[PDB]
Amino acid sequence: VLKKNPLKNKQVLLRLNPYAKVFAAEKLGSKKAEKTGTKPAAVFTETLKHD
């Protein structure tokens, strides 16, 4: 009789999507990426800074 919105109403969010509980549990909205120390080539930097 009435359309309840998910993205509010966490009850209907958990009804539609069982993965939302464990998404919130491990906080996959804020997932920290692994740091990589690679550097661009000198040709890339001089092309970028070229007039």
Partner: protein, 159 residues
Amino acid sequence: GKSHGYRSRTRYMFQRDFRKHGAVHLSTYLKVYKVGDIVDIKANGSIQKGMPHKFYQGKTGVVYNVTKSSVGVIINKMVGNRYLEKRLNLRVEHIKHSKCRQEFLERVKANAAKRAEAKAQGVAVQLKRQPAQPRESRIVSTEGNVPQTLAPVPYETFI
């Protein structure tokens, strides 16, 4: 007064060609037409007998009748808000075979051969045509291709 005769406004349409006047070559007479063939209509101006009307120039039809020097062709014509079928008696100088049908036929033959060879393996035949897909990712190198910078040019007279 106004003037709507049979060959009205057909000057350039029934003009012959550049450097292709004269007699017609014998392959047009040696072609064979059977009932059910798909043909294109293009009038030859040097053959005044059995000509199509100017409406049917550039039209494509199906053969329904074969006579001594001529072919019966069926054209669907838009009149008012619907189509009527029209039967045309055209001499074979104004007729050539259409190539769209035979391309579809050779596609059918290759498609059936592919299906038959893949029937013994079961390898997800994929027999339908697809449109031009968006292109995939690629890596573009600068070895020997360091990018060259361009700028807009100023105005000049050039006369």
